[PDB]
Design a protein around this ligand. Sequence first.
Ligand SMILES: *[C@@H]1O[C@H](CO)[C@@H](O)[C@H](O)[C@H]1NC(C)=O
Ligand SMILES: *[C@@H]1O[C@H](CO)[C@@H](O)[C@H](O)[C@H]1NC(C)=O
Ligand SMILES: *[C@@H]1O[C@H](CO)[C@@H](O)[C@H](O)[C@H]1NC(C)=O
Ligand SMILES: *[C@@H]1O[C@H](CO)[C@@H](O)[C@H](O)[C@H]1NC(C)=O
Ligand SMILES: *[C@@H]1O[C@H](CO)[C@@H](O)[C@H](O)[C@H]1NC(C)=O
Ligand SMILES: *[C@@H]1O[C@H](CO)[C@@H](O)[C@H](O)[C@H]1NC(C)=O
Ligand SMILES: *[C@@H]1O[C@H](CO)[C@@H](O)[C@H](O)[C@H]1NC(C)=O
Lengths: 314, 224, 223
Amino acid sequence: PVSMTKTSVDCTMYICGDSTECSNLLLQYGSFCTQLKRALTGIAVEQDKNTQEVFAQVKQIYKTPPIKYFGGFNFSQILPDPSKSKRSFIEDLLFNKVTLICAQKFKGLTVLPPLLTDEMIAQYTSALLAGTITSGWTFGAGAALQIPFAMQMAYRFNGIGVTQNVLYENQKLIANQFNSAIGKIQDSLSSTALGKLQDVVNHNAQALNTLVKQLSSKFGAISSVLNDIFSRLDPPEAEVQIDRLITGRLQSLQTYVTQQLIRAAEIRASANLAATKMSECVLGQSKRVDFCGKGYHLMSFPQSAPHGVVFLHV
Amino acid sequence: KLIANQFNSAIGKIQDSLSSALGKLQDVVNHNAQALNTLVKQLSSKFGAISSVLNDIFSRLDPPEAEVQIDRLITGRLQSLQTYVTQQLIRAAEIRASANLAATKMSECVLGQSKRVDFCGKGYHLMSFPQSAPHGVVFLHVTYVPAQEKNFTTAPAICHDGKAHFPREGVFVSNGTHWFVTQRNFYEPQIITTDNTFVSGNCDVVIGIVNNTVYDPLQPELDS
Amino acid sequence: DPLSETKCTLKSFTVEKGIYQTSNFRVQPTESIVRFSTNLVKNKCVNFNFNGLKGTGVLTESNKKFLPFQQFGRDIADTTDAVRDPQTLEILDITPCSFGGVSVITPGTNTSNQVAVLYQGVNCTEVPVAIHADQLTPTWRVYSTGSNVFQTRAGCLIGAEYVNNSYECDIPIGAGICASYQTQSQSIIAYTMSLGAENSVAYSNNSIAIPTNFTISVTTEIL
Ligand SMILES: *[C@@H]1O[C@H](CO)[C@@H](O)[C@H](O)[C@H]1NC(C)=O
Ligand SMILES: *[C@@H]1O[C@H](CO)[C@@H](O)[C@H](O)[C@H]1NC(C)=O
Ligand SMILES: *[C@@H]1O[C@H](CO)[C@@H](O)[C@H](O)[C@H]1NC(C)=O
Ligand SMILES: *[C@@H]1O[C@H](CO)[C@@H](O)[C@H](O)[C@H]1NC(C)=O
Ligand SMILES: *[C@@H]1O[C@H](CO)[C@@H](O)[C@H](O)[C@H]1NC(C)=O
Ligand SMILES: *[C@@H]1O[C@H](CO)[C@@H](O)[C@H](O)[C@H]1NC(C)=O
Ligand SMILES: *[C@@H]1O[C@H](CO)[C@@H](O)[C@H](O)[C@H]1NC(C)=O
C-alpha cells in the first residue's frame, strides 16, 4: 500500500448540522476544530507526497519502441495497450480485484480525490517499465542508455554471480520460463491475494462508518437530536445537554483523527518501503536477500494498484 | 584534475543553493510551535462553563456549583492536554523513523560506499559528507552521474576458431567496421584479447554472435 | 471575500501560496415552519417541526416511497432523511442545507489578492443553486457564477482559466489539476500538470549507448 483515502471533515456540519446555537457553542470550543482540520490536511498532503515519492521516481517519461521484441521475452501482459485509461492487462486485473458516500457527504465527511489520477500513475508505471526494459539500471543513475535485453539480462546474471554463457546457451529456456511465470501471475490474479489494499480500503470505510454511527449516540444527554433537547429543555439547562453532546462528538472526532494519524503513519512507512523497493529493485538489481523476491533477485517491474503498487519480482 | 574541479564546482553549487530547501526542519519547528500555541490558545475555551478563568468561578459560584463547573473545565483541559501528548507521541514516532533512516544513511553512505540505488543520491554513489543542521542532518552525497553517451553496435559474443568468446568484465562494441571490448560505465576501447575475453561453448548456441579475430598475446612473443 | 474568508480561517492576514479549506463563515436566514399550521416552503433551507421531528434542512420531493404505517424515514446516522407530513401525506426528502467545501486557491497575499474558488463535489451548472448565491454579497456572486468556470473531478473551479499547456504543479487542486499565478495581465491559470519530458529510448537488437564522459555531482539530502 502507498496511499490512503484522503478524508476531510467540516465541524459545523458533523457536530451541529445546520443548528445556529450549536455552532455558536462549538465556537466556544474554539481551536479544538482548527487542530483536527490541520491534522487531516497534513494527512492528505502526506498521502499525495507518498504517491509522488513512490511513482514519480523518473524525470523523463519513457516510451516503448513500436516493435516489441526484447530478447524473446513477452512483456505484452505487463505493457500498456493503446486500446483503452491506458493500463496494462495485469494492471486491469489489479484494478478490478479491489473494489453510502452520499450519507457521509451529508454529514460533512468528504473524500478528496488524489492529486495523481490512475491514468497518470499508470503513465508513471509505463515510464519506469519502459526505462527498465530498454535501459536496465542506467536510467536510474542518469540518462537512459539503450542496451539489448539479452545483454541486460547478462548484466543481471553477472550481478547475481552467474557466468554470462548460462543465459546465452539457454536464452529460449529463460524466455519461456519468464513467459510461463507471467502467465502464472495472470492466473493467480484473475482466478484468485490483494489483502493489504482491501484491508486499507475496508479500514477507512469502517472508520468512516463508525464516525457516522457516533451521531446516533445520546452520550448520556436525553436526546441525540440537537433541536429536540432545545425544545424539551430550559435554555440554560439545554446548553448543559448540548455541551455534553458537543463534548462527546468532539471526543469521537478526536478518536477518528487519532486513529487516522496512526494509520497514516503506518501507510507512510509502507510507502517509504515501497519507494525504497522501487529505487533498489526496479531501477537497479538488489543483493539484499528477500528484499526483491525469494531467489537471486534479477529484476522487477512496477504495476499500479488501487492505493498501492505491485512489484513483479523476476 | 577534472574530478577535483567538478567536485569543487559541485560544492560551490551547494553553497549557492543554501545561500539563496530546508523545509523539513522548519516544518518540524513550525509544528512544535503551532502545537504549543494551540495548547496556549485552548486555555481561552470556557468548555461550557461560565468563564475560562478559574478565579471568577470560585468567587461567583458557591462550592457545590463550582465543583461541577471546574470539573467541566478540568476534564476539557485534560482532553486538550491528552490531544497534545498524543500528537507529540505520533510526531515523535515520525521523527524516530526519520532518525532511524538518517542513522542508516550515516552508516551505509558516510561510513562506506552504497550499491543501493538512490539510497545515497541520484547516480552511482561514491561517498557522503555529514553536516549538522537545526534538529537534523544534511548529507552531501557525491555521486557519479555518467554523461556524453555515444551509440555503438554491440554483440553478445565473438566467434574465433569456431569458439564463442564472452567478456570477463565488459561489453563488445564496434566503431563501424572495427570491434573492440570496453567497460560498461565508461568508454575505453581495448583490443579483444584472450586475457580480456573467456572462451565458452560453440558459435551455434549463442544468438546474435558475430565473427571477429581475438588477438592472442603469446603469438607475437613466439615469433620474437 | 473567499480570500478574507481564508484570512478568517487561518487567523492571519498574510496568506501563503497554496490551497486552503475554509469554513462556511457566510450565514443564511432560516424560516420556521410548524405543521401538525404554517405554509410549506420547498427547495430552500428552512427550520421544520413536521409532527415533532424538529431538524433544519432543504425540503425536496422524494422518489423513495414509505409503507402506509411509516410516518418518517431515518438515515444511517439516526438523523431524519425522509418525512411524510400529516397535513398532506406526501413524502419530502430532507436534503441538508447544501454546502460543498470551499477551497480557496490563492498565490501569496503579498503577490496578489486575486483568488480562485473550488467547490468540492458539486456540478458547475448547479453551483448558484447549491451555495445560495442569491442571498449573499455580490463579491461572492462574482465567485459563484460568471466567466472562467471549469469542471474538475475534484469539483467546480471558478476564477482560474484552464490552459491546455502542461506545467509543473504549483498549487495542487486534484486529479491532475493544478493552478499557478502566471503571465498570460498575470492571473491564476489552471492546467493538467506535466509528468515530464516525453523521451523514446532507441532500442535495437545490436545497439548500446556507452558514456564517454561523466559528472561528479554533489546532492543535498536533509533529514
Ligand atoms: C531485431 O529487431 C526486431 C525488433 O527489435 C525484431 O522484430 C527482430 O526479430 C529482431 N531480430 C533478431 C532475431 O535479432
Ligand atoms: C505474448 O503473450 C500474448 C498472450 O499470452 C500473445 O497474444 C502474444 O502473441 C505474445 N507475444 C509474442 C511476441 O508472441
Ligand atoms: C543514437 O541513436 C538514436 C536513434 O538513431 C538517436 O536518436 C540518438 O541521438 C543517437 N545518439 C545518442 C548519443 O543517443
Ligand atoms: C575505429 O577505431 C580504430 C582504432 O582507434 C580506427 O583505426 C578507425 O579509423 C576507427 N573508425 C572506423 C570507421 O573504423
Ligand atoms: C563466421 O565464420 C564461419 C566459418 O568461417 C561461418 O560459417 C559463419 O557463417 C560466419 N558468420 C557469419 C555471421 O557470417
Ligand atoms: C453536470 O451538468 C452537465 C450539464 O448539465 C451534465 O451534462 C452532467 O451530467 C452533470 N453532472 C452531474 C454529475 O450531475
Ligand atoms: C568531459 O567533460 C569536461 C567538462 O565537464 C570536459 O572538460 C572534458 O573535456 C570532457 N571529456 C571528454 C573526453 O569529452
